[PDB]
Amino acid sequence: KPHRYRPGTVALREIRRYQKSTELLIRKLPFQRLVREIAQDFKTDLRFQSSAVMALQEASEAYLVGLFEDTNLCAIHAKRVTIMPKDIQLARRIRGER
Amino acid sequence: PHRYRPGTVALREIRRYQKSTELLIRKLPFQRLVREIAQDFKTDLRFQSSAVMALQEASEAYLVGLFEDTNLCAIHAKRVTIMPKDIQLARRIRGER
Amino acid sequence: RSRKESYSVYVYKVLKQVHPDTGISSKAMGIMNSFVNDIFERIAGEASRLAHYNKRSTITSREIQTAVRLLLPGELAKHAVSEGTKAVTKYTSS
Amino acid sequence: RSRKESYSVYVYKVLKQVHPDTGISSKAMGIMNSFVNDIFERIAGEASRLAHYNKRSTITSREIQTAVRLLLPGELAKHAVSEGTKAVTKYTSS
Amino acid sequence: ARAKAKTRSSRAGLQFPVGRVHRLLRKGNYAERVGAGAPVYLAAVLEYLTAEILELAGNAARDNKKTRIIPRHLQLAIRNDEELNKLLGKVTIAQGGVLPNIQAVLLPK
Amino acid sequence: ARAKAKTRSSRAGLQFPVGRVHRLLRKGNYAERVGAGAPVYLAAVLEYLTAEILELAGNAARDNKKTRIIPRHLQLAIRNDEELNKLLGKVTIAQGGVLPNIQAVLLPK
Amino acid sequence: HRKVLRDNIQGITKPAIRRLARRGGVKRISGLIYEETRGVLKVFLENVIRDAVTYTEHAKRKTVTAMDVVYALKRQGRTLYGFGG
Amino acid sequence: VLRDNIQGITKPAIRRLARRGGVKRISGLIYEETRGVLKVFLENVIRDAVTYTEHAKRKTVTAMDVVYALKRQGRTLYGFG
DNA sequence: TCGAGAATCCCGGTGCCGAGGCCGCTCAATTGGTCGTAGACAGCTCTAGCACCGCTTAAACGCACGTACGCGCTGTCCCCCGCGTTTTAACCGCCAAGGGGATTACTCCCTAGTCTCCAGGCACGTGTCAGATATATACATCCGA
DNA sequence: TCGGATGTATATATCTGACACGTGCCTGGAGACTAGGGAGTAATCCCCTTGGCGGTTAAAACGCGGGGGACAGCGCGTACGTGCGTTTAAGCGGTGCTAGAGCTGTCTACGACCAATTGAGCGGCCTCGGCACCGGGATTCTCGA
């Protein structure tokens, strides 16, 4: 009979691996295209330094990871282990972003 | 006897206090508390009259805003009563702890 | 005896232009004084930092216009920019 | 070709005093450069505002000491104040 | 013979004082020198924002049958706008109160 | 005859430069004039705070068997203190990571 | 009459805390809220008053002015209108 | 020109970000909601950075422009100048 | 409570590129005088902060009752996790072109600094009307039969 | 669905103190003039940004099976809301005193400014050892019988 881990065992192993490393978790090329698309609406024919795109990516990942920390606390407060869209909305409301 | 049902007088009081603008803490007890706290940083201090008024206006505005966020947390857990755990969660997300 | 200065005279003139028949209490006049002083320091501080980034030593109307675009949101910034441009053109023509 | 300046030389001297056998990478040296510049502007800005409230036109060591008490928390402020006082006394004695 | 004096505000068509704003910029330690158009531009923007608030506050005062403007009227004007509420989002107004607002789940069936 | 030159840092017993700090204060538009003791006091405080961070970071580097200090070591030093974490509570450190932390309800029985 | 003060946090009574919560729009309050609220207020007041006394001492005065309180609140991101400035 | 680039932020990448935050179970409607939040964040920062670039009369966004924009919003970043 | 399987730790050997040190050299800090004003100190005037006393009453406190809300337990079902298979595009290395950032010279116009002069804005004084308060309704809302 | 009880909106009459407006005056803004350096413009050099191509493999996308977590429903008990009778201290008006904030006049020492002079710190090379990577075995943690 084949081997299978139970649900939630591989998930905990991945939490430990990613909380120990420091590299970026979004692919470089798709992120660069998204940044250039957004800037078109403010000005045409712009150029970016290489380090400018890196600075934007470091700030964006740090913002999202912090948001997921607060979202997790709201879900536990309601006796759950699954994060839901209403958990994200409550966190952004109290933080004053909305 | 003409007892009202539970929660009917409470809704009446929300409407009355959300329409007025006066201060809700008594003035003499608040002044004593301010003087007690300050004596730990320095002895034999005097206060201007408007200085104590400014402190009270800021303190009430801070607490009323905190109660607004606490109420949202309790509803998120399918309740209508507020509990100390609701206050703790709100202050943690706001970054005060 | 030293004498102090405020914006009460100028605020009252503006009020008589948009509502010719309404007055204002002294407590409300104090709040408007705080508002004008607060916005003045926000704009002047940002324009000061702009001149330092670009190695200039003068604050001109160009630095003021860029600071207004950074601080005011949305449609407020568009209306404020056109007011400032119109006043400078009229002042220069005379 | 213009040449720039940093705090890299001075940071390296301090490191050799608390850990005589450890080095540092270039990425970590860039982070320490940002830290020193950030703290410098926080202290200088607060001391500038202090002189304005009290109608002075000079920034002295008294304004620096009051600014450190406002910004640093707890036991960090106590240790920093004694470091600054000792350096000024030694500089004046010579 | 010297010509008749004339304020800098009158030649710009403004009500806020251009001379006083120029002096405040010079003695605030913002830069080494101040251009001639900077005070005119700044005074016009301050006057525009004052007109916006006073217009909305006067509407609120007349709404509840009053002649004068009190701090409660200023608070109602600010929190009911969308842009003004965003510009003054970290400000407390003394003797202002709050907006009436009750959550829907608290109402009786 | 002029006496031998002597740095202002050496007279105060410091490692951070007193002359450069004095120039930065003069050309930063902070006040009209700068006293003679202000640069000495400021340089000593900056040097003290640098020594605090580097000492904790070196302990972290040696903890996981390394000779040099990398950005991960600086982040571990800062977030594990109580006062340093409060002074730098709004700062992001590039290539720093996070502290390992799992909520207790998520662990298996 | 420099007689000290003690146990003044109890002057913030239960009815006063109830009025503050009604303006925030809450409907039912549990019995352990009152002790919790007193602790929160004390922490807030300590931080503001410590800064105000620091401003008073640097000016070499013995009286806390309304200007001192306004500067301390602004330094913590809680700007207040209506008391000068 | 470019279009439909928000879908380059895939579902596996969003899962890795939540794992670093310590999340164990994710519902299926999270992914579309996260993309909306990121787009709002990037619009605010990039609009400020282009304003700094124009005032200097340049055609290239520098790393210093991005650092100034982040600091204006209370989001200081170390390690880029 | 035990075996089988899969993941993770530990160790030895190889190789490379970045940290650390060394050499010119030039520009910024230091030394030595001069001078004018910002700030320290003494003296004096009068505002306002503190302490006390008697009294009227609105608010705080304590007690009894009952209802509705919080919480624990059960059952079901469908959504989300773990895993194997195929498909796609990210990444790397290497060319090649030129758009634009960065530096240097030159010149002139805009801003600071003085001095005279006069009108705008501040402190004070005064009278009346907008708003606060008491009373007597008129009507809308809640609750049990 | 309806009547009784309670709370609240509305209209009338009366007072009072704060707002709005004169009046005198003084100091800050405006007019006219001069001198110097900050910034605008042209020219030039070279770096670093953009675009393209081909190969390799790691990651993304898809489908499927089933375990467990979310959610609805039910029952019970206790804690919190409502209301009444008694007790406490806040608010108010009015005296009285002196501590200290605020203003004014002298006078000196300290910080700006300028001109020589030289050594500290920056840019540009070299070079070797700390760390990255691969492969093989040991140890541990999970899962079912």
Gyration radius of chain F's alpha carbons: 21
Contacts of G22 in chain B (CB under 8 A): 10, 13-14, 16-18
Test the E interface: residue of F26, F29, F30, F34 with most E CBs within 10 Å: F29
Domains and CATH numbers, chain F: 8-93 (1.10.20.10)
> For residue C91, what are the contacts with CB-CB under 8 A and spacing of at least 6?
E8, E11, E12, E37, E40
Angle between the N-to-C axes of helices D8-18 and D26-53, in degrees from 0 to 180, rounded to the nearest 10: 110
Quick one: CA dihedral B79, B85, B89, B90, positive or negative?
Answer: positive
Torsion of the alpha carbons at E30, E32, E38 and E39, rounded to the nearest 10:
70
Dist. CA D81–CA F44, nearest whole Å: 9
Q: Which C residues in the span 31-90 are in contact with G, Cβ-Cβ below 8 Å? A: 31, 33-35, 37-38
Could you please state the CATH topology (level 3) that the domain comprising A24-98 is classified under.
Answer: Histone, subunit A (1.10.20)
Q: Which CATH number do you get for residue G62?
A: 1.10.20.10
- Report yes or no: D47 and D63 within 8 Å, Cβ to Cβ: yes
CA D64/CA H2 separation, integer angstroms: 53
CA–CA separation, A90 and B69 (whole Å) = 10
CA distance E50 to C14: 8
Residue H67, helix vs strand vs coil = helix
From residue H22, alpha-carbon distances to A5, A19, A65, B96 in Å are: 20, 8, 9, 21
Residue nearest to nucleotide J7 (CA to C1'): B12
N-terminal to C-terminal alpha carbon distance within chain D:
40
Q: How far apart are CA F27 and CA D76, in angstroms?
A: 29
CB of E68 lies under 7 Å from some atom of strand J: yes
Q: Which chains have 3+ CB pairs within 8 A of G? A: B, C, D, E
Resolution of the coordinates, Å: 2.6
Residue E13 sits at the chain B interface (C-beta within 8 Å): no
- Euclidean distance between CA atoms C59 and E35, whole angstroms: 6
H17, H23, H27, H30 alpha-carbon torsion, rounded to 10°? -40
**G/F Cβ contact: 3+ pairs below 8 Å:** no
Q: Which residues have CB under 8 Å from D85's CB, separation 6+?
A: D65
- Residues of chain H contacting A40 with CB distance shorter than 8 Å: 1-2
Q: Which of residues 29-58 of B touch strand J (CB under 7 A)?
A: 29, 44, 46
Query: What is d(CA C28, CA E72) in angstroms, rounded to the nearest whole number?
Result: 9
N-term to C-term CA, chain E: 84
Q: Is residue E71 classed as helix, strand or coil in its secondary structure?
A: helix
DSSP C58: E
CA torsion through residues E13, E19, E20, E22, sign: positive
Q: Domain limits of chain B?
A: 23-97
Distance CA H29, CA H33 (A): 7
| Inter-chain CB proximity E58 and C61 less than 8 Å | no
Nucleotide nearest to F67 (CA to C1'): J130
CATH 1.10.20.10 matches B23-97: yes
CATH of the domain spanning D1-94: 1.10.20.10
Alpha-carbon span F31 to F85, nearest angstrom: 31
> Which strand (E) or helix (H) includes residue D33?
helix D26-53
Q: Does G74 touch chain E (CB under 8 A)?
A: no
- Under a CB-based contact definition with an 8 Å cutoff, are residues C34 and E73 in contact? no
The DSSP bridge partners found for residue H60 are A47
| Number of structural domains found in chain G | 1
Question: CA-CA distance, F5 to F7, in Å (whole number)?
Answer: 7
The pair phi, psi for residue G81, each rounded to 5°, is -100, 140
Q: Which residue is nearest to nucleotide J123 (CA to C1')?
A: D3
* Chain I: bases < 7 Å from a protein Cβ: 5-8, 18-20, 28-32, 38-39, 48-52, 59-61, 66-71, 79-84, 89-91, 99-103, 110-112, 117-124, 130-131, 142-144
Query: Shortest CB distance from G11 goes to which of B32, B44, B59?
Result: B32
Tokens at A89, concatenated: 């909305």
Contact E12, C91 (CB under 8 A): yes
